[PDB]
A paper describes a structure:
Matrix metalloproteinase 1 (MMP-1) plays a pivotal role in degradation of interstitial collagen types I, II, and III. These enzymes have a similar domain structure: an N-terminal signal sequence to target for secretion, a pro-peptide domain to maintain latency, a catalytic domain containing the catalytic zinc, a linker region, and a C-terminal four-bladed propeller structure called the hemopexin domain. The collagenases cleave the triple-helical collagen approximately three-quarters away from the N terminus of the substrate, resulting in three-quarters and one quarter length fragments that are unstable at body temperature and undergo denaturation, rendering them susceptible to other non-specific tissue proteinases.
It must be mentioned here that the present structure is an active site mutant where the catalytic glutamate residue has been mutated to an alanine. The structure comprises of the N-terminal catalytic domain, the linker region and the C-terminal hemopexin domain. This is the first unliganded structure of the full-length MMP-1 where a water molecule is seen at the active site providing the fourth ligand for the catalytic zinc in the tetrahedral coordination sphere. Also observed in this domain is the salt bridge between the ammonium group of the N-terminal, Phe81 and the carboxylate group of the side-chain of Asp232. In essence, the hemopexin-like domain undergoes a major displacement towards the catalytic domain, thus widening the cleft between the proteinase domain and the hemopexin-like domain on the active site face of the enzyme. This altered configuration makes the active site residues and the RWTNNFREY (residues 183–191) interface, a segment critical for collagenolysis, more accessible for native collagen.
Residue numbers in the entry: 81 to 447
Write the structure that this text describes.
């Protein structure tokens, strides 16, 4: 996080805010809701409170304006700058302006008022742009269908006003770092020559032949998917990639969730209704066998037969000597299975049912 130069800060802890005019793009109700919830994100992690007023001046004056609109920060029509807010302070201080030749929404369509307002109000309280890609204050517009403060945002805002008067203290997701040797993965899959690691709302993509890591929201590519993947694998045969969460599984082609999916695992792969979820999955280069891992047991399914194999609720620790009895993630590369469990990574050889290397979970990255 980065605190606005000069460290402007509101002196009162009980602030007032007013919505001057309303955008035509939405019903007043929807605008009101967006703003309210935007303020709440901030009041949840600090002692500050925001009260909506109707008449008269307020600390934070909110408005929808078009082009040059009386303040020296002219808007640029459709596109470009969506909004801007001023530092805490008297007058125009703390005010937020949304550019009206923007198409404010309440859905996944660009640009969602709640999301942009949550960000603007940040500047309204004294925060500047963060260099943390996962932070709400980051300079951009991403939409993971659920606006929330990243741990970085909380630290930034608490540094100016103190922490929540909550006895528990809210927390926010932390952005994974590739050079942290404490890194662990929710799931991993290969895709058109690259390896794609998943962790919370993020993903880390790499081509092992030229180590250079790409970090970003899973929603940048597949907005439909629910954040919190548990397993995943590629099936280049159909050029798809399947993700598992809960007990249903989404399939994807290119950058769009295929028709109908999600779908049930039981009806799609044939798995006893006993299995709640899944821990990890991989598919053999060109053998047609796909291995799914649950708990300490594993199962095999034949793609070219839309069906499992004769009695397969077998043991992990037994047929995969060395990796232990629980898989966090796994993917295949050049004939070897790469198993992940916590920060541990075992390079397993299918042929010799042998373990060649035992590395750190993030060993692939350049650190
Ligand atoms: Ca604009
Ligand atoms: Ca003001
Ligand atoms: Ca508009
Ligand atoms: Ca997992
Ligand atoms: Zn303005
Ligand atoms: Zn900003």
């Amino acid at each position: 996080f980065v605190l606005t130069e000069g460290n402007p800060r509101w002196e009162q802890t009980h602030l007032t805010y007013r919505i001057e005019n309303y955008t035509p793009d939405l019903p007043r109700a929807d605008v009101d809701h967006a703003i309210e919830k935007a303020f709440q994100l901030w009041s949840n992690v600090t002692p500050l409170t925001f009260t909506k007023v109707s008449e008269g001046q307020a600390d934070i004056m909110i408005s929808f304006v078009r082009g040059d609109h009386r303040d020296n920060s002219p808007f640029d029509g459709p596109g470009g700058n969506l909004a801007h807010a001023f530092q805490p302070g008297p007058g125009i201080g703390g005010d937020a302006h949304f550019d009206e030749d923007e198409r404010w929404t309440n859905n996944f369509r660009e640009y969602n008022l709640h999301r942009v307002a949550a960000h603007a109000l940040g500047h309204s309280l004294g925060l500047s742009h963060s260099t943390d890609i996962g932070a709400l204050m980051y300079p951009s517009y991403t939409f993971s269908g659920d606006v929330q403060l990243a741990q970085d945002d909380i630290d930034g805002i608490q540094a100016i006003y103190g922490r929540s008067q909550n006895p528990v203290q809210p927390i926010g997701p932390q952005t994974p770092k590739a050079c942290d040797s404490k890194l662990t993965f929710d799931a991993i899959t290969t895709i058109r020559g690259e390896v794609m690691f998943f962790k919370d709302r993020f993903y880390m993509r790499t081509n092992p032949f030229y180590p250079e890591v790409e970090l970003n929201f899973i929603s940048v590519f597949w907005p439909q998917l629910p954040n919190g993947l548990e397993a995943a694998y590629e099936f280049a045969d159909r050029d798809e990639v399947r993700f598992f969460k809960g007990n249903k599984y989404w399939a994807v082609q290119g950058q769009n969730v295929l028709h109908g999916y999600p779908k049930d695992i039981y009806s799609s792969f044939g798995f006893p209704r006993t299995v709640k979820h899944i821990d990890a999955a991989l598919s053999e280069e060109n053998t047609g066998k796909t291995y799914f891992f649950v708990a300490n047991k594993y199962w095999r399914y034949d793609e070219y037969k839309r069906s499992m194999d004769p009695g397969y609720p077998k043991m992990i620790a037994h047929d995969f000597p060395g990796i232990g009895h629980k898989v966090d993630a796994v993917f295949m590369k050049d004939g070897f299975f790469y198993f992940f469990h916590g920060t541990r990574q075992y390079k397993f050889d299918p042929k010799t049912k042998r373990i060649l290397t035992l590395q750190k979970a993030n060993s692939w990255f350049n650190c």
